């Protein structure tokens, strides 16, 4: 006739969450802890956009690797993305010494300094610096790398060079070479006249003399005769020095870089879209806001922890039984 | 209101032969001299396009091989001879009173000789790899009736979980059907087998048809 | 559940009473309505939402995870890799599932301690002033009022008042 | 030459409100009813109201009296349909037709689509033999499209080149997230011998996205 009654709340939202007793059960209120979804783009990390790389590896890149052209002098980035099977690697076929600890070491740098470390007309007088092969090709026309100096001989000689560069520049710098092992004997003989060839680099924390082997190979991209190459990081203050008598592929641009930290490799086949999320995957942006996202393990900066799990709701009100 | 229902619900009649369609309805669609009755064709993708109105007139376009025809609480509609083309569903509709209002619809499906369904299995791409997932899909196409039965084999084991199965409509051109099926495993589980086999059961042959893959 | 009040002797929810979680009917003379317990509900919320903040807190977010790429001769390294990979998500997947399915009932029991702990509170003032009978509710001796039933709530009933007369109707049931 | 031309497939959260257009041209807009009709997956056509563009003057069915409001735009000859407080229920396709007793030239028909999920584009991927076994004269190709939570993609072959016996499978949900599959039959002669892209949309996101399909590897 005149009471009083206690109970406890009940909406109409369907929010489902598992306990350990029970599962699937519904609830008042719910708070997702899961991310779960992305865009599918490559947007700008905090505002600087990524080196998208394109059709090139990241040896292409480097090297110059003249289908790579256009994507140089892009010194300022976030993060380097290649595609997953990149069709412009090495235009010269060989081997790249120590290709994944510079892949890893140009994975925090975020500056360039692409500068001419042996500048052409002023430290190559003597010798040929007109080196074009046939399989570094661009427009239908022959090229080579545009940061090595393919060095031959002028007027028959090829005399002993004995070049070095003082790294003035106060920061870590890049150097890159090659080193030519001719298909047959006949051509060491032409391109740079000595059967007993040499080719040493030394600096104060690096000394690797190179001899080359001159034998018949298998033919790879129509070139049977290989080139190798090697890098080194020169410490800010100390002297490489190169002197050679053949097969030498010197460094024409080298590159003065600062290290920093947030970026890395990414392959995927996203497109840009001028985004600026604050955190990407190969297969979108993260939202950001939840402490768990199974979107992709692979992440650049500043997301949620990876989970493979479907779903993780936390229940933040109480069971729903309603009338 | 007018309820309009429409019999049969599905129908299947031969190549070059009569299709009836009939549609009864709650009450008398007859309004001034003339029914206001409408009939229309939806192939499947498609917007319904007008095919009789005010109970037997044709609009322009379309063959004359359609026919309405009806007064009063029950209309029909004849197709003659039916075509390829003519696979799609159709409705009824009347016109008379607020509010306007459709059939319940149904399906022409065209009799034709059987077929054996061209069996295709593609590995997950290399890209989809990196996903964190890969999905082996198992083509069928153009097979004849509906009836058909896939089963998945890793390893020889049969695997029924974690499949997806999705049919298509008959071809408006071929009078055909088609499905895929789709396993979604993990990245991990999927590199702990080799033999990836989908066998189809069909009318047209006492033992299944089998294809598949390794990955060597 | 645990307590036995949710979904247990208090039967369903109530799909009125939208001011909050937790609170009392009095279905009376003058009128009838809801009215939700801000001093039980402010803590609830208080505590739950304590959890949730305390909960993403202790996982500091993950920065550029961009996974190492070896080359044909490494493969020890390589499955190496995998393993300290995939091994952390093995953890963290399987340290976070069990989190949410082990605290989604300590707040589900939780709710079901603070009604059945809200119920008792209103039985320690109402002694023998009224009987249980609803499960989950009381049936005044003494024809309660609104002034009254506001007089339930904030601490604010006391048996002497309406004892006596209290007292008078228990003799004849 | 007289043709409707709807909007885009659009998503929203219960509870919003769309506006729906179709803009007319190829007859004189201002003097033909325009007509709207709603036909859910599986179910039947429902007819909802109606707007007079010369005067305005609406026709509305008794079921969709409250959710359904209608009006027109005679200089930009178009037609526009606002819907409230939606439900599950109302996550269907949406016709915009001519006619007053005879539903006469209709519109293309978007699908508003009422769920949780929030607007992913997908990825594509293509599906290659794999094996070098020549099974026929012909070979058939496909593309894959994974993970989109809104509904419309259209798959077509070399931008529609290709007509011959293509097939796009119906989309299947998992998890909220839509997936289905398209396959082609092109002569193993022309084929890896000339270049078979397939294309593909996603309206929903203003997406476009191509792949072409070549031979697996390990070669
Ligand atoms: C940047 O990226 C682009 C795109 O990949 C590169 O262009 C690509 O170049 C390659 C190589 O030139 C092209 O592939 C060749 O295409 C030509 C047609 O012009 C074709 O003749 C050639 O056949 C080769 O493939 C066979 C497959 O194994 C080889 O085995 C074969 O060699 C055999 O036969 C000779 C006969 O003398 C023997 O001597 C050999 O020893 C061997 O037995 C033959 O060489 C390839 O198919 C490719 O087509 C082209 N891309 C496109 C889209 O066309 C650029 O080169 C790259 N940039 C740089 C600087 O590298
Ligand atoms: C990156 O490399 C890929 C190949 O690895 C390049 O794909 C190529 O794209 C071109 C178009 O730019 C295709 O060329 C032809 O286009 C004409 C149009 O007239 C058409 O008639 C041909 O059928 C063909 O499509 C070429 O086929 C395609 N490569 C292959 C192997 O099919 C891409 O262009 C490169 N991107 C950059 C920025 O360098
Ligand atoms: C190419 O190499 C030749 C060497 O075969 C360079 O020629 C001469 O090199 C010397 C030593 O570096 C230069 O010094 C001068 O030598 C003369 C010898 O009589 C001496 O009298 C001078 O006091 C001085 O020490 C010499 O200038 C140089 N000659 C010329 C014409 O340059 C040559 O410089 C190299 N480059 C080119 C472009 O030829």
């Known amino acids: 006739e005149d009471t009083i009654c206690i109970g406890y709340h009940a909406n109409n939202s369907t929010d489902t969450v598992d306990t350990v007793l029970e599962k699937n059960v519904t609830v008042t209120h719910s708070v997702n802890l899961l991310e779960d979804s992305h865009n599918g783009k490559l947007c700008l990390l905090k505002g600087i956009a990524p080196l998208q790389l394109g059709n090139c590896s990241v040896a292409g890149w480097i090297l110059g690797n003249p289908e790579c052209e256009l994507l140089i002098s892009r010194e300022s980035w976030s993060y380097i993305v290649e595609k997953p099977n990149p069709e412009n690697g090495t235009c010269y076929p060989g081997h790249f010494a120590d290709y994944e600890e510079l892949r890893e070491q140009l994975s925090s740098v975020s500056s360039f300094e692409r500068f001419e470390i042996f500048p052409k007309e002023s430290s190559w007088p003597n010798h040929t610096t007109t080196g074009v092969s046939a399989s570094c090709s661009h427009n239908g026309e022959s090229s080579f790398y545009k940061n090595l100096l393919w060095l031959t001989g002028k007027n028959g000689l090829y005399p002993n060079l004995s070049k070095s560069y003082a790294n003035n520049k106060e920061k870590e710098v890049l150097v890159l070479w090659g080193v030519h092992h001719p298909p047959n004997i006949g051509d060491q003989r032409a391109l740079y006249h000595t059967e007993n060839a040499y080719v040493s680099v030394v600096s104060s924390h690096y000394s690797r003399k190179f001899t080359p082997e001159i034998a018949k190979r298998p033919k790879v991209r129509d070139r049977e005769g290989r080139i190798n190459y090697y890098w080194t990081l020169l410490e800010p203050g100390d002297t490489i020095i190169f002197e050679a008598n053949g097969n030498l592929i010197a460094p024409r641009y080298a590159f003065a870089l600062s290290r920093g930290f947030g970026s890395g490799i990414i392959n995927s086949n996203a497109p840009m879209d001028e985004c600026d999320a604050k955190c990407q995957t190969p297969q979108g942006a993260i939202n950001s806001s939840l402490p768990f996202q199974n979107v992709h393990p692979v992440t650049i900066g500043e997301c949620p922890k990876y989970v493979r799990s479907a779903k993780l709701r936390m229940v933040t009100g109480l069971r729903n039984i309603p009338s | 209101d007018i309820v309009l229902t429409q019999s049969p619900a599905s129908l299947a009649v031969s190549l070059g032969q009569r299709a009836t369609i009939s549609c009864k309805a709650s009450?008398?669609?007859?309004?001034?001299?003339?029914?206001?009755m409408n009939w229309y064709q939806q192939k499947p993708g498609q917007p319904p396009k007008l095919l009789i109105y005010?109970?037997?007139n044709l609009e322009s376009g379309i063959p004359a091989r359609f026919s309405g025809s009806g007064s009063g609480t029950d209309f029909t509609l004849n197709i003659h001879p039916v075509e390829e083309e003519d696979a799609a569903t159709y409705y009824c509709?009347?016109?008379?009173?607020?509010?306007?209002?459709f059939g319940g619809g149904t399906k022409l499906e065209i009799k034709r000789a059987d077929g054996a369904p061209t069996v295709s299995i593609f590995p997950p791409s290399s890209e989809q790899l990196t996903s964190g997932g890969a999905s082996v899909v198992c083509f069928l196409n153009n097979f004849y009736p509906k009836d058909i039965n896939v089963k998945w084999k890793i390893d020889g084991s049969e695997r029924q979980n974690g499949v997806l199965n999705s049919w298509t409509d008959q071809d408006s051109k071929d009078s055909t059907y088609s499905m895929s099926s789709t396993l979604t495993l993990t990245k991990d589980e999927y590199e702990r087998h080799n033999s990836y086999t989908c066998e189809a059961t069909h009318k047209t042959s006492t033992s299944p048809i089998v294809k598949s893959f390794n990955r060597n | 559940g645990l307590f036995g009040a949710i979904a247990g002797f208090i039967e369903g929810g109530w799909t009125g009473m939208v001011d909050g979680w937790y609170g009392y009917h009095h279905q009376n003379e003058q009128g009838s309505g809801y009215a939700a317990d801000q001093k039980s509900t402010q803590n609830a919320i208080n505590g739950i939402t304590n959890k949730v903040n305390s909960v993403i807190e202790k996982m500091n977010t993950q920065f550029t995870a961009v996974g190492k790429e070896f080359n044909k001769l490494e493969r020890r390294m390589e499955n190496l890799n995998k393993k300290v990979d995939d091994g952390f998500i093995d953890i963290w997947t399987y340290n976070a599932e069990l989190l949410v399915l082990l605290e989604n009932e300590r707040t589900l029991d939780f709710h079901d301690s603070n009604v059945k702990n809200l119920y008792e509170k209103v039985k320690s003032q109402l002694k023998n002033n009224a009987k249980e009978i609803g499960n989950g509710c009381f049936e005044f001796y003494h024809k309660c009022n609104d002034e009254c039933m506001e007089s339930v709530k904030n601490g604010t009933y006391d048996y002497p008042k309406y004892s006596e007369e209290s007292k008078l109707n228990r003799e004849k049931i | 030459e007289v043709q409707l031309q709807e909007s885009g497939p659009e998503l929203v959260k219960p509870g919003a409100s769309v506006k729906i257009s179709c803009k007319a041209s190829?007859?004189?807009?201002?003097?033909?009813?325009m007509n709207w009709v709603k036909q859910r997956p599986g179910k039947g056509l429902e007819w909802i109201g109606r707007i007079y563009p010369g005067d305005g003057d609406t026709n509305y069915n008794g079921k969709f009296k409250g959710k359904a409001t209608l009006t027109a735009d005679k200089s930009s000859s178009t037609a526009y349909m606002q819907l409230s407080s939606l439900t599950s229920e109302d996550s269907a396709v949406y016709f915009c037709a001519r006619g007053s007793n005879s539903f006469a030239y209709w519109g293309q028909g978007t699908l508003v689509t009422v769920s949780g999920a929030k607007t992913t584009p997908p990825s594509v991927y293509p599906l290659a033999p794999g094996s070098a076994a020549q099974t026929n004269s012909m070979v058939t190709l496909g593309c894959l499209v994974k993970g989109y939570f809104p509904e419309p993609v259209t798959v077509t072959w070399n931008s529609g080149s290709l007509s011959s016996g293509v097939h796009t499978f119906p989309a299947v949900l998992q998890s909220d997230l839509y997936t289905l599959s398209s396959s082609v039959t092109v002569p193993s002669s022309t084929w890896p011998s000339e270049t078979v892209t397939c294309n593909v949309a996603h309206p929903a996101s203003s997406t476009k996205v191509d792949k072409k399909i070549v031979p697996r590897d390990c070669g």
């Open positions: 009450q008398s669609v007859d309004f001034d001299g003339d029914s206001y």
């Open positions: 005010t109970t037997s």
């Open positions: 190829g007859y004189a807009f201002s003097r033909s009813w």
């Open positions: 509709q009347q016109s008379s009173e607020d509010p306007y209002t």
